[model samples]
Target: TCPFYKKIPGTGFTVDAFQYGVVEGCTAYFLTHFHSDHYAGLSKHFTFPVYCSEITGNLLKNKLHVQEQYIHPLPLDTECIVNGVKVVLLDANHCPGAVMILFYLPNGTVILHTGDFRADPSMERSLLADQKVHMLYLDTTYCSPEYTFPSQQEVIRFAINTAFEAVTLNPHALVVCGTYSIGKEKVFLAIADVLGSKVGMSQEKYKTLQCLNIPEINSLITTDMCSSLVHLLPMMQINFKGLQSHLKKCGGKYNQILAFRPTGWTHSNKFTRIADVIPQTKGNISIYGIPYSEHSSYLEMKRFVQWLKPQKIIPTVNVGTWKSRSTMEKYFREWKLEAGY
Candidate 1:
């Protein structure tokens, strides 16, 4: 045990340098995006130079406000040599800053480490070009069809329709959708579209949209800028209990609050059980779910693997482990082997 490396429980490989080392030798580089699971250990445990896309760099500095010792701001689709290894950063269609990294060794062995990525159909043409990849580390968090999300367009349509219908039903009621503070900017845009000129958003919401620079989407949008919508109609950032608490306080004021959640409470009783733990709402907490997700769906993941036709498919995230692995194993078993180490 070199103190910087130890074997991961199920996979049998060591992930020591970042997790346990008091100080690492800067051998391992970060290929991260905005997801907490990907970069969770960095701030406290790891302090070496972190490598990521420019968009991700801005996101961390302006949005997440992370301060670290070494931050190598890399542009998308560009390659650079760092510590004798050729590293290339690529766009991952999950969130704005999401990325994947290709680490090329001197021996012609290329390892493609995919961070949390969604297979965006719109971005199908641009990714993974000119790369003869040997090993592809896939994000199989939702490898199964059942865990897949709907198209972005479809999800936006659903959200808009749901918001309009709710507003029409009760003109006095407010709609509260649970989105990530930075991730679900589209949902907020959809709401503004539904409300037209009548919508009044928070300053925080306005700033969030402005920073994203989706000017076309926000040109028609308007906000109160300072007034409290929490009393009227609060749009909550996606958190389990936070949604329920808002509902209990203000649900009675309106017909019902619309909540868009990642947990997919509409599909399962797990959220219901958790909702039970919280106090009841006077008016119902309507969970308007669209299958929109940041991670790749089963179909998208499959197609990516099929296109790459790599000798091996290694999974990085839990979503990839569940969704992409079995299919790759079934058809390409001859070439693909799950790494236990």
Candidate 2:
């Protein structure tokens, strides 16, 4: 429940809801992004007014079938008042259209909701210059010191180079990169540009990418799977079984299948070494795990909190059961104590 909604102390606005949906209890609603976990219970039939970034609003209107009239699109950095609360949106570097919500409550408290984002240096300076933050709803997806990873740009560069090398080494092989339904367009677009090829995407993915309206991306996406040597597939479909099925469907057209998954999880301390790239073989498929992440590492999180100096921290991820709350608090306390500032 904590992750889903946060009731402003004096104001009655509920920030986000997964189970509550549109209800009378909440005076207003704000959606941080279009991620399924973030907008779990939202639907086309929602009756309440919802506020979000223009890109998210477009996604809701076109993909989720949410009515346009109910969706209020907010431009980044623009301040607006809703039900007596002053709100501003900041870009969340996690995905396109994702935003970090800044609420200036009537009580003179600023509450920042970091939907899901990697800390950008410029945004850090902007937020640090602002007034004290009362509460911070943080994205703790990689809230452990063991999660240190490289920057998104570095990882994308590695992925692009790896793809080119793979194709060059094995001319008949198909280079498939894994990405979320809406995330990691940068990697796909980079690979296309470096290889001078069109990215093969599904119809649904094509529509989602089209809405982005970046001419560079739109100019390089194709629906024909066999037309390009490199194929961009959803992250969920990168497993051994999925790859085997895909290869079968291709009718032996590709001599080898090289699968690449760019994620932070691949570089966790749980593993022996921190690698720029790790390669493995699952049956007949060749798999490579690239250490790329969209969320802040634990070190980044600590630095962010130290700079912003929020009075209270609220985690935006569900930690399992009610006991998980205690676990989360303990980590925060321990981390804060370690910071000694």
Candidate 3:
């Protein structure tokens, strides 16, 4: 989906295709989320109109500083006309404000572009679910059978359980969770909720979360790092050296940090209990690679494909290589491989 996001086939528009700059034929541009990869190639000064979810527009203006007049924020589940094409946004279930774009061309062809999403059972109830979709542009991040990540809910539960145990064993052990700009708030927030602690985050981080305005989680923020044992840091900072530096910076207030680095990279098909995952430790730091992915798992994708049974599928990830592209295409073909779901 790298370059393909630039210009979708059916409309006179581009979705998250910013790398090379604006397209000649397209007047309106669409952004699926606030992630760097999706927003890649956004010009600091461009004379084109951009469309996306309301929360994402907040990021574009306050975070990226894209001007107000140039940005158009669309409400989810509501129909609107963009360049005369009917469009609606569906919850992507990936991250805050992430959306799966649905479009209806005047010619009767309907298209669904899942920029990046975590599939869910509730999606079946979407107004577009029962419609005939001619094309499905999918987020194939975990399309391969080898990449079967656990559900986000289960992963969060495991993190909460494991984190609770860690802190219970050593009550003073500082909790440091890794995160990017807008995602992974669920894991850390749940940890704080179950533990009944406040979260210390950077002002920039706080600003973005404020824009999201998600209830309950907002009030957990604390200005003073010393006031809260649960701290949020950049994903790379969850390691031993970083933690050591962080501890020293705080004047040795935290002796040991139970750090959680969440990602889908460490895919799994089995998780019988907390003991199944060997939470790693090196002296002063403990790092756990929690299988928390924003992308859809293979099984979930299979189910979605089975239910939709679209006329065609266009992968939006890992499709660069000739081999890789075909590898992804086969899964699409066989989903009803009649021979297959």
TM-score of each: 0.70, 0.90, 0.94
Cα distance off (Å), candidate 1, residue 264: 5.8
Worst ten-residue run, lDDT, model 1? 4-13
Which portions of model 2 miss their true places by more than 4 Å?
Answer: 1-5, 251-253, 267-276, 282-284, 322-324, 334-341
For candidate 2, the lDDT comes to 0.77
Per-residue error for 196 in candidate 3, Å, reads 1.8
Q: What's the C-alpha lDDT at position 37 in model 2?
A: 73
Q: Over the stretch 1-341, how does candidate 2's per-residue lDDT look in tens digits? A: 34343665667666667456455467667887777877878778887888889888888888888898899998888778887788888888878888998888887888898888888666876643667788888887877666777667777777777778877887777878887757777876787778778889788988887766566665789899887867878798988888888888787788788888876675343554433346788766888777667788777777777777677898876555677667667778886687774
lDDT of 2 at 230: 72
lDDT per residue for candidate 3 within 243-294, as digits (tens), equals 8889887776767888888877563445444447777888968888887888
Clashes of each: 16, 0, 4
What does the lDDT come to for candidate 1?
Answer: 0.55
RMSD of each: 7.1, 2.5, 2.1
Q: List the residue pairs that clash in candidate 2.
A: none
The order by descending TM-score is 3, 2, 1
Summing lDDT over every window of 10 consecutive residues in candidate 2, give the lowest-scoring window: 267-276
